[PDB]
Amino acid sequence: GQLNPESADLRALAKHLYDSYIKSFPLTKAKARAILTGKTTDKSPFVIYDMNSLMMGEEVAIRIFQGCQFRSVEAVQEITEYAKSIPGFVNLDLNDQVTLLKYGVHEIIYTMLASLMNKDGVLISEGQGFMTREFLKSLRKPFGDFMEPKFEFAVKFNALELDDSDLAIFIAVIILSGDRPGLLNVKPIEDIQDNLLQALELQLKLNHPESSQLFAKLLQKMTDLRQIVTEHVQLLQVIKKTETDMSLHPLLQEIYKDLY
Amino acid sequence: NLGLEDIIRKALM
Ligand SMILES: *c1ccc([N+](=O)[O-])cc1C(=O)Nc1cncc(C#N)c1
């Protein structure tokens, strides 16, 4: 590789995307990791690890999904604002802009949820709480199965040790996916994505010397993101088919509305 | 998910 006009342009694109990402997304990976590693003086979340601690911290499934979707409107808007900053995006056919975002937002929301997760649990209530993974897994069916696949993904994705400057480019690559169904004009999308992929490959070489094949490993994570999104349909089918009791403590319903 | 499409379309305006 050489430092030439093309590589300098790819670094400028990376910086433009990082600056727009910081402007668009108040909750960054750096802020979430500072909380989760105890490297902050200011925020100490309450830990919810069992029914007792749940109380000390003071249709059901469909209500959860309606609630978390409503709570995720702000994220959808932030991702849309970010997309407008990707060079070329707003010049695409408007039908295609909507198609790219309507598929991409779910994958992006799961990518960013991983920043809030470690092997032990997930930040909730705007960083003020931490809900454990094994407590979520212990809840009665179908609830106890909702989040575990996301934790399995997050552990593997977080093992790549990406930072916010890496994530800004990766999220742009997700948005500019020429494979989405119903796209009218695939070539101009792939033209932008090719530029974004070049910028991502250079970013990961410069930022991760000790990683082998990080670019390929990161692109392969898109398979896991897609699987989780695709499985949401099956989860709705499981709910309708569940004949057992699906009551759930009101505070747990509120916690799940903060997830996805 | 027409609700989601409407959110995105409005946010693009
Ligand atoms: C909201 C809260 C909690 C969960 N969960 O625990 O599984 C899920 C949701 C939710 O509605 N997730 C969702 C909604 N629309 C699309 C996709 C995708 N892909 C996920």
Distance from A102 to chain B by nearest Cα, in Å?
6
Contact A178, A186 (CB under 8 A): yes
Residue A1 lies in a domain: no
Tokens of B7: 């959110």
Residue A232 lies in a domain: yes
- B7 lies within 8 A of chain A by CB: yes
Of the candidates A151, A142, A163, the one whose C-alpha atom is nearest the C-alpha of residue A123 is: A151
Q: CA dist A7 to A12, A13, A202, A203, Å?
A: 9, 10, 8, 10
CA distance A136 to A144: 6
**Residues present in chain B in total:** 13
CATH number at residue A228: 1.10.565.10
| Full DSSP string of A65-90 | HHHHHHHTHHHHHHHHHHHHTSTTGG
Residue A92 lies in a domain: yes
How was this entry determined?
A: X-ray
Contact A131, A121 (CB under 8 A): yes
| Full DSSP string of A197-213 | HHHHHHHHHHH-TT-SS
CA distance A244 to A258: 25
Residue A155 lies in a domain: yes
Backbone angles phi, psi at A117, to 5 degrees: -115, 145
Contact A133, A122 (CB under 8 A): yes
Please tell me the distance between residue A255's alpha carbon and the centre of ligand 1 in angstroms. 13
List the domain range (segments joined by +) for residue A63: 6-259
Spacing of C-alpha A229 from chain mean position: 11
Mapping DSSP to helix (H, G, I), strand (E, B) and coil, where does residue A113 land? helix
Residue A114 lies in a domain: yes
- A97 lies within 8 A of chain B by CB: yes
Distance from B6 to chain A by nearest Cα, in Å?
9
Instruction: Name the residue with the closest Cα to ligand 1, atom 4.
Output: A260
Instruction: Report, in angstroms and rounded to the nearest whole number, the Rg of chain B calculated over CA atoms.
Output: 6
Residue A252 CA neighbour count, 13 Å, CB half = 23
Tokens of A20: 């727009």
DSSP class of residue A45 equals P
Mapping DSSP to helix (H, G, I), strand (E, B) and coil, where does residue A190 land? helix
The answer to whether A69 is annotated as binding is yes
Question: How many domains in chain A?
Answer: 1
Q: How many separate helices (H) and strands (E) can be counted in chain A?
A: 12, 4
Residues 100-119 of A with CB under 8 A from B: 101-102, 105
Instruction: Name the residue with the closest Cα to ligand 1, atom 3.
Output: A260
CA distance A88 to A94: 12
Spacing of C-alpha A215 from chain mean position: 18
Phi-psi region of A141 (alpha: psi -120 to 50; beta: other; left: phi over 0): beta
Number of other CB atoms surrounding residue A86 within 10 Å: 25
CA distance A193 to A199: 10
CA distance A120 to A71: 24
Residue A18 lies in a domain: yes
Tokens of A61: 């499934």
With contacts defined as CB-CB under 8 Å, which chain A residues touch B1?
102
Of residues A80, A90, A94, nearest to B11 (C-beta): A80
Residue A84 CA neighbour count, 13 Å, CB half = 13
CA distance A90 to A84: 6
How close are the terminal C-alpha atoms of chain B, in Å?
19
Contact B7 A76 (CB under 8 A): yes
The answer to whether A89 is annotated as binding is no
CA distance A245 to A179: 40
Please tell me the distance between residue A33's alpha carbon and the centre of ligand 1 in angstroms. 23
Of the candidates A176, A220, A222, the one whose C-alpha atom is nearest the C-alpha of residue A198 is: A176
Residue A171 lies in a domain: yes
Q: Which atom of ligand 1 is nearest to the CA of A258?
A: 2
Residue A152 lies in a domain: yes
